[PDB]
C-alpha cells in the first residue's frame, strides 16, 4: 500500500499551523524547577522557562500532561530549537 509521503505530508500541513505567532496547544512533558518541556508538533519540544508559569503569587499552576497554550515564535532558531513563548500568548487573552 503506497500511501504517498506526498499525500501524508499534505495532510499533516493541514493539521498544524506553522506561522510565526500562532498559538498552539502543547502538552507539558516535564516540569523542571526552571524549564517546562512543551511539545507542539514541530522539530523539537520547547524548553519554556518556568518563570512564565509563575502567577503573581509565584506558584507553578501546571502539572505534567496538561495542554498549555503557547505562542509559536519561531520554528528554528538556527539550532533546531523551536522557540515557544507562552508569555506572549497571554496577550490574546
Amino acid at each position: 500500500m503506497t500511501e504517498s509521503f506526498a499525500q501524508l505530508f499534505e495532510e499533516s500541513l493541514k493539521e498544524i499551523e506553522t506561522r510565526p505567532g500562532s498559538i498552539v496547544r502543547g502538552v507539558v512533558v516535564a516540569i523542571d524547577k526552571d524549564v517546562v518541556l512543551v511539545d507542539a508538533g514541530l522539530k523539537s519540544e520547547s524548553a519554556i522557562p518556568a518563570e512564565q508559569f509563575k502567577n503573581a503569587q509565584g506558584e507553578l499552576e501546571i502539572q505534567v500532561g496538561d495542554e498549555v497554550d503557547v505562542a509559536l515564535d519561531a520554528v528554528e532558531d538556527g539550532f533546531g530549537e523551536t522557540l515557544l513563548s507562552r508569555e506572549k500568548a497571554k496577550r490574546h487573552e
Binding site: 509521503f5 511539545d39 528554528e76
Partner: protein
C-alpha cells in the same frame, strides 16, 4: 524491529533545519522546503533505516559491542536508558576527544575509576581527615559521570550509533580512522560523507530519537537472543 512511515511522520522525523544552514550533500534526502524549513524525505529514510537495522542485527548476533553516542541535552537521557535496555554501552556526556584513538589513556582512567571506587566502596575507608576523603569522593563522582557508560567496555567497540552526526562529528572521525562502522541519524545540516550507514531524519526531537533508539535496542536484543 520495524517502524512505520506513519509513526515517523507522527514522531516528527521529516522536519529539518532552516534552508540556509543546510549542507548541500544532503540534497538527495531533501523532499523540499516549506516556511524556510527543509523537509526530509521519508521514502529515503525507511529503506535506509531498515537497511541499517539489518547490519546492526548482524553485529549483535556476532556478540558485537555497540556504542550509543549522543550528548545533546535532548537525547542524553534517552541514549543512556535505551542503551541499558539492551546491555550495551553509551556516552551521554561530552565526548572526550580521543576516546577511541587514545584508548590507551582512557583505559588508564578506567583503572583509576575502578581502583577509586573500590576504596570508597570495598575499602570503605573515608578515615582520611574527612576532608581528603570527601574530596576523593568528588573525584570518584566526576569520573563516574564521565565514563559510566563505557567503564566496562574493555576494548574498542564494533560499531557506533550516534545521534546528531554534525554535533558529534569528532566521534565519527575517530571511528573512520579506526575502521569502526558508524550508524548516524543525519539532519539536513550535517555531513553524510563520514557515515557508513546514513539514516536521514530529524535528530533534535525526543519523540524522534526515542523512536530511533527503541527500534535499535529492540533489534540489538533480538540479535543477541538469536
Amino acid at each position: 524491529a520495524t517502524v512505520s512511515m506513519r509513526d515517523m511522520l507522527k514522531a516528527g522525523v521529516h522536519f529539518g533545519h532552516q534552508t540556509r544552514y543546510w549542507n548541500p550533500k544532503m540534497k538527495p534526502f531533501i523532499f523540499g522546503a516549506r516556511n524556510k524549513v527543509h523537509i526530509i524525505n521519508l521514502e529515503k529514510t525507511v529503506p535506509m533505516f531498515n537497511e541499517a537495522l539489518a547490519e546492526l542485527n548482524k553485529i549483535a548476533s556476532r556478540k558485537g559491542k555497540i556504542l550509543f553516542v549522543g550528548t545533546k541535552r535532548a537525547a542524553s537521557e534517552a541514549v543512556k536508558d535505551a542503551a541499558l535496555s539492551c546491555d550495551q554501552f553509551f556516552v551521554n556526556h561530552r565526548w572526550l576527544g580521543g576516546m577511541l584513538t587514545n584508548w590507551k589513556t582512557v583505559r588508564q582512567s578506567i583503572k583509576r575509576l575502578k581502583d577509586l571506587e573500590t576504596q570508597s566502596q570495598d575499602g570503605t575507608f573515608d578515615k582520611l581527615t574527612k576532608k581528603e576523603a570527601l574530596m576523593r569522593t568528588r573525584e570518584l563522582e566526576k569520573l563516574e559521570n564521565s565514563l559510566g557508560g563505557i567503564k566496562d567496555m574493555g576494548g574498542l567497540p564494533d560499531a557506533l550509533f550516534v545521534i546528531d552526526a554534525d554535533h558529534e562529528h569528532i566521534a565519527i572521525k575517530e571511528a573512520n580512522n579506526l575502521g569502526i562502522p558508524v550508524f548516524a541519524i543525519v539532519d539536513t545540516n550535517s555531513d553524510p560523507d563520514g557515515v557508513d550507514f546514513v539514516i536521514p531524519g530529524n535528530d533534535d526531537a525526543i519523540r524522534a530519537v526515542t523512536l530511533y533508539l527503541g527500534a535499535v535496542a529492540a533489534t540489538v536484543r533480538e540479535g543477541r537472543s538469536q
